[PDB]
Amino acid sequence: QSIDQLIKARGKVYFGVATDQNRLTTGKNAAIIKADFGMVWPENSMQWDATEPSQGNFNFAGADYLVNWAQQNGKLIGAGCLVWHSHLPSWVSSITDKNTLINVMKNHITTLMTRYKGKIRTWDVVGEAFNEDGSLRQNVFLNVIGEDYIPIAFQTARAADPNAKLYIMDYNLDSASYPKTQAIVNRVKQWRAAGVPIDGIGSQMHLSAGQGAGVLQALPLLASAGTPEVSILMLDVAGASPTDYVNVVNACLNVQSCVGITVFGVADPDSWRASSTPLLFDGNFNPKPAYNAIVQNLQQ
Amino acid sequence: QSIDQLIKARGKVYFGVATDQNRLTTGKNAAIIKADFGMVWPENSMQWDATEPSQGNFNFAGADYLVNWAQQNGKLIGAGCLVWHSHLPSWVSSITDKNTLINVMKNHITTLMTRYKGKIRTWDVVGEAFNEDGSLRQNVFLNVIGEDYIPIAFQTARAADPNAKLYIMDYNLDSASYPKTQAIVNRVKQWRAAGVPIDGIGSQMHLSAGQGAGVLQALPLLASAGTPEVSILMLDVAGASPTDYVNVVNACLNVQSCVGITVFGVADPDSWRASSTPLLFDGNFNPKPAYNAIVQNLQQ
């Protein structure tokens, strides 16, 4: 059975997966995505270092391929991340003038979002903006522009494509007792009260064995920020225990504003941490017990 | 052991593999390439649709990543294909004016080769130029320019980077009686007699089970064209039988002008025909029997 069909039958929007051109032309990835998943994301083809490697020199061939494939095959598209320190080319980090950096950030956002206007359901606008202690991460945008870079990014994104859901994304939001989880909730509440158009919080979830249970309490906490949506992004789980995966799916089901889940690839050998075998399909493209456990859970 | 070190000890230049950025950051590909292979090729990041998706406007982020990684890790680099019909954006195929298409083709060749001047050992300049019956394939270049497009392409490439070895590449050159094999020999001899700088023939070798034996006769026939070099390119073998792979390696060893072999990826799940398990490593990144058979053949 298709986990995307089953999660839609329980009132959610999608079960999705990250992919890109050379996955779709190799292995069994295209066949599995067509049958079992409802939304694709670019693994890497939309990141800043892939799309604007030097100023004004936009590289769209890879992202175009993915968007086309998804439209032909009737899949939803999510994309990101527009502003994220980790995938930033050096030409951006070396800018020290505030007005320049604001315009460079705006141009990057507007150019990417305009190109795909109306085709992208969800955009990750700002990523990994918090330190582990809950303070704001001192990336180039915070250092040069200040804390208004976040309002500016979201305002710019809303103007570029008013149809898209705009998300802030972070990782290590997997425990309700962790300071970072509480901090992002408090800051998003205050940004939204001031009119910043943040539609969603996306939890980048790279879990160790046994950490699924904690998400049952972390996800409701993220939802308490009052955004229209929350989601689970680029999920994988070391060891791929059915218990961990089922717990994450049940957290999604329990939180009414959680629209769906995106796993971080199809088959284990194509994972960034392949030795931990953390995905739902094995190296022979066979479903693993965690896939069947999700199916069972969604049927009941 | 490393098959690249062992083939070097037998007097050849390399045992290589096709890869690209997202392979180097996932699975065990980087570790295996570092240990076992001596030359990397771009799986897709140098093709025309990836590098010049609109006229005069280039996308080099993916190719730059590969070239940098290879230099950092002491690997040789091969690249291609500059002029192929199968990877051509629609804007090129629509051109109907001979001078315009010549200029477009020359600009494509010169821009890519200049960017990496001196860094690339082998360039595939023209690919898949022949029909199965041995006549020239009627692609946009033949239809608009005529059969001079091949001389022009090679002369332009030689001027752009004199260091590089320049190859023509085709598939189904695997049997010595097949018409395409003799046809490429006939034409390459003619072109070289006219001073066209074709340094090599690359045989793009996608074999079915049992076809390795015929390569022992086909590869020397290709070498009879008199090019300085021949190579085996983008090799895979349905079923990955040790007998097939050993026969291909021995054909390389038997042909003095054959400089090396490149396989079409590391592990079976990342093959374009994964259900035929045609590569040297399995879905858990373990060497397969064919890998060990090549090791022993090269030591004996």
Numbering used by the authors:
A (entry chain B), B (entry chain A): 4 to 303
What do the authors report?
HG3.17 was evolved from HG3, a higher-activity mutant (S265T) of the in silico design HG2 that was engineered post-design to reduce the active-site conformational heterogeneity observed by molecular dynamics analysis of HG25.
In all enzymes except for HG3.17, the unbound state is never pre-organized for catalysis as both Trp44 and Met237 adopt conformations that would prevent productive binding of 6NT. From HG3 to HG3.14, the unbound state is never pre-organized for catalysis as both Trp44 and Met237 adopt conformations that would prevent the productive binding of the transition state. From HG3.7 to HG3.17, no further changes in catalytic residues occurred during evolution. Yet, catalytic efficiency increased by approximately fivefold.
